[PDB]
Chain A
Amino acid sequence: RPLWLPGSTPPAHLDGSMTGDFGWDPLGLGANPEAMTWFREAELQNGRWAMMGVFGILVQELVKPDVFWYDAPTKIDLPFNIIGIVAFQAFAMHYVEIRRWQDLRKPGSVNKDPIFSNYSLPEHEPGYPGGIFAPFVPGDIEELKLKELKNARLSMLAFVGFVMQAQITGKGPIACWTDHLADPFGTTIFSKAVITLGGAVKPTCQIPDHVAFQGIDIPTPCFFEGFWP
């Protein structure tokens, strides 16, 4: 089967089973059937938030107004306080999730609509709630299911780019996009740092600490600068 490394020899416990299994386990965390099932949800969860997140920042910049994203201040301003939202954020996501988390651990018991009964679906796959969540079904096959991971697993991997780039380069995702294509051999953060024997240069973080928001510290330091190239 296709693998992450075309000449590789996939680990024993992982063969051709889960959606999109290319045989990648340096550490072999999937050998445990119980925990791998847990991890199986996380990959979707981390993926499905990042995808919707990475598409957020990009749209947040190019079509939208341009402030690379550290912003509390917006042009949707701050309509209802903050502690107003965070109040409603907790109770919202609390119900939303400890609900879905229970369909992971003890499957099917949640399918009923709490108020009245339209239910949902049969028990299906713990991390793929059918029915009301997936009405449209653009592709008709689990080919589309393998098609979902390979997008997300890139986006999660892509998101980390936005952090680090916006650390030292101090610019949004698509700003440095165009900045690279102009004089490409510059701005690789390969050029921009060396650390050979003797000499060590590192670019300094272009975002500062102590960002002022409504009279609050918010230290927000850089991510482990000392070990940067």
Chain B
Amino acid sequence: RPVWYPGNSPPEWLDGSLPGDYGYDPLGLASDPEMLKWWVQAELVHGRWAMLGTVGMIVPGVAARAGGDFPQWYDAGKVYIENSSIPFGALLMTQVLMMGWSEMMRYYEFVSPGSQGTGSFMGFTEAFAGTGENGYPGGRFFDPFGLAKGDPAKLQEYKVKEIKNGRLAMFSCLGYYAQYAATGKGPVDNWFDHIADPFHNTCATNGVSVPF
């Protein structure tokens, strides 16, 4: 198996079948078998918020080239409550209400996979029952196109794509933060700035990353 840092062998505990398992645990935090399935969900969740976050940053940025007046991802928080029309408290506290429902629901299917779709949440049996893997609910709502139902050999082949596209969305979304704190400008602005004058726009020239 094509491990990272070729020439070594994977940590002996995880050689197993996990989508996108390259044998990378250099601090050995999967050593607890009970805890590993908790990290596998932890990644899957971050990978899914990443891939939504990245597009959510780039598109309003890319939208701004043609005009169309959007903000950058930073200071899009202000611009909305600048124009407001609903208070900040009501919004953040509707978050915690609706959002906390899903997560605290998402959790007790991880704890005990049987419940959450036994029934008696507005019916909806088998939509929430979960398909048995850690971070994959499946079902009617979460899976409207009925994918991950037919051929499994094609499914396991998506589960790999999802992670590998997720691990990249995270590692890019670390760039959006870091290259904002330095250049103080949007992600697609930088993607033009370096594509225009690559030589003087590079990382060493932001005056922050390379202090003197």
A interface residues (Cβ-Cβ under 8 A, vs B):
12-13, 27-36, 38, 197-198, 200, 202, 225-227
Residue of B nearest to A27 (CB): B147
Interface contact A31-B149, CB-CB below 8 Å? yes
**Distance between B134 CB and nearest chain A CB, rounded to angstroms:** 22
Interface contact B65-A198, CB-CB below 8 Å? no
Contacts of B212 in A (CB 8 A): none
Contacts of A225 in B (CB 8 A): 66, 68
Asked if B168 lies at the interface with its beta carbon under 8 angstroms from chain A, I say no
Asked if B150 lies at the interface with its beta carbon under 8 angstroms from chain A, I say yes
**Distance between A115 CB and nearest chain B CB, rounded to angstroms:** 35
Asked if B173 lies at the interface with its beta carbon under 8 angstroms from chain A, I say no
Known: A28-B150, A29-B147. 6 other contacts (CB 8 A): A29-B150, A31-B154, A35-B146, A197-B195, A225-B66, A226-B62
Interface contact B65-A226, CB-CB below 8 Å? yes
Instruction: Evaluate whether A34 and B146 lie within 8 angstroms (CB atoms) in the complex, with A225-B66, A225-B68 already known.
Output: yes
Contacts of A31 in B (CB 8 A): 149-151, 154
CA distance A198 to B192 in the complex (A): 9
CA distance A13 to B146 in the complex (A): 15
CA distance A198 to B196 in the complex (A): 7
Interface contact B66-A30, CB-CB below 8 Å? no
Residue of B nearest to A198 (CB): B196
26 contacts between A and B (CB under 8 A): A13-B151, A27-B147, A28-B147, A28-B150, A29-B146, A30-B150, A31-B150, A31-B151, A31-B154, A32-B149, A32-B150, A34-B146, A34-B149, A35-B145, A35-B146, A35-B149, A35-B150, A36-B150, A200-B65, A202-B66, A226-B62, A226-B63, A226-B65, A226-B66, A226-B68, A227-B62
Residue of B nearest to A202 (CB): B66
**Distance between B194 CB and nearest chain A CB, rounded to angstroms:** 12
Residue of A nearest to B149 (CB): A32
The listed residue with most A CB atoms (<10 A of its CB), out of B146, B150, B195, B196, is B150
Residue of A nearest to B196 (CB): A198
Contacts of B151 in A (CB 8 A): 12-13, 28, 31
CA distance A202 to B65 in the complex (A): 11
Contacts of A202 in B (CB 8 A): 66
**Distance between B175 CB and nearest chain A CB, rounded to angstroms:** 21
Contacts of B150 in A (CB 8 A): 13, 28-33, 35-36
Contacts of A33 in B (CB 8 A): 150
Interface contact B63-A32, CB-CB below 8 Å? no
CA distance A8 to B96 in the complex (A): 51
